[model samples]
Target: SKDPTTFPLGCSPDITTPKKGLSMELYSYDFRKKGSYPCWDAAYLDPNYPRTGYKSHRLLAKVDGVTGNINFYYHATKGCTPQLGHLPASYNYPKPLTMTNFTMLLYGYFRPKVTGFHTFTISADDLLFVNFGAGNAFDCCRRDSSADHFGNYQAYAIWGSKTAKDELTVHLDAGVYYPIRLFYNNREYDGALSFTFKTESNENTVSDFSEYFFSLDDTEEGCPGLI
Candidate 1:
C-alpha cells in the first residue's frame, strides 16, 4: 500500500487542502531549500528502487538505480570490531561490481518495540541523506547526515574520511512499521555510511535487521493510501 499522506507538492491545507505536515512514506525527501523554506524533496521510487520484502542482518544496496549491482552492507558502531568499517564486498573499486560514480536509493521499514524518544545518529561519507517522514519530528526537513564518525558536524565526502554526525530525535509508536529511505551519492572513494539508534532505554547500536522490513499487506493500518 502507498502512503496516505502523499500529496502533490504545494496544495497546502491553506485552502485546497486541510492538513498540517503531510508526508511521503516510501521516499526520502532531500533538504532542498529556498530563501527561508525547504520545499523541495527529491525522492526516487521506481522499478530500480530496492523494496525490502525480505529480511537479513545486512541491508541490500543497489548501484546505478534499478539496473545495477547488488551490495549487501551494514554499519558498525564506533568502537566495535570488524575493522575496515563496513566496506561491502561488491563495492571493491576496480572490480566488476564497483560503480563508484553512481547514485543509490535504499528503502525499507523500521519498527520500535517500545514507543519513546528515539535518536538516530547518521554517519556518512561522500554524500548520504535519509528520511523517516513526519515520524522524524523536526521543524526542519528529516535529512540525517551528521558526520563521518558518531558525533556532530556536517561535510560531504571527498572533503574527508568521515563527516560530523548529524542527529534527529523522533517518537515512534511501538510495533508500528514506518517507511525509511537512505539516499546516497559517491563522488569519489567508497563511501562510509551507517546509523545507530538510542532510546532513553536502549543502547547505541546498529539497526536491527529483523525490524528493517515488515509486511504491510496493502491494508489500512496507521497510514492508509494508494499510489
Candidate 2:
C-alpha cells in the first residue's frame, strides 16, 4: 500500500505512490570461450570496464527483502521456457530472462518491524555478493565493496559446485530503513542464488521479511512505519 502523498521536488508525478520492491538491473556479456572467463568481481570493479557490451535492462522485483531461491535450472527442463526470473509472476518483471553470461544488480532499503539481531544466510552458485549497510542507509551510487556480509568467491570449486553458505548476525533498529545491495553473475550455465534470514526469537527458522522491503519512494516517505 502507498503512503500519504508528500509532493517532493523533482518527484515523478506518475510515481507519486511508489510500489514496494527493489530496483534491479540485468547486464549481459558476450559468450566467452571455455577457460577464458572473467572474474565477476574483477569485471565489476575494473575502472575501464567495457560499456559497449552493455546489453542491459531494468525491472523491479515487487517483493520486500531479496530472500528466497533464484534458480535457472531450465537447462534440465526440456521445452519449458520460464516466464519469470527469480520471482513469481505477480512480482517478476516482464523482461525476457537469460541463463548464461549475465549479471544482476539489485538495490533498495529494508525496514524491520522488530528491533533485534537478525541472522542472514546467503548462498549462491558461480558468483554472488551482498552488502547490507550498518547504522545508516546504503547508497547505490558509491558502489562500495566494503562491509560485505556474504559471497561465494572464497572457494571457487567448480562450474556449479560452489555450494557454500555464509551466515551473519547483525543488529537493526525497528522503524529504520537500512540500505541493501546484491550482485550475482553467472559465468556459464546453471546459476542460482538463495538468501534467508531468521530473527533472534526464531533463530532456527527463516522468517518472512516481505514487509521489511522498501523502495526509494518508501524511504522518501520517511519509511512509513506501517507495522
On lDDT, the candidate that comes out on top is 2
TM-scores, each model vs. reference: 0.45, 0.58
Model 2 per-residue lDDT tens digits across residues 1-227: 11111110111112344346666666654344434434233353332232222234333233333433333342313112212244333225545555544566666666666677776777665555555652122332222332222222212112344345666567767766556656666554456666667878764655344666555543222333222
Q: Count the backbone clashes (under 3 Å) in each candidate.
A: 12, 0
TM-score of 2: 0.58
lDDT on C-alpha atoms for all candidate structures: 0.36, 0.46
Q: Against the true structure, whose TM-score is highest?
A: 2
RMSD of 1: 15.3
| Stretches of candidate 2 exceeding 4 Å from the true structure | 1-18, 33-87, 134-137, 140-163, 218-227
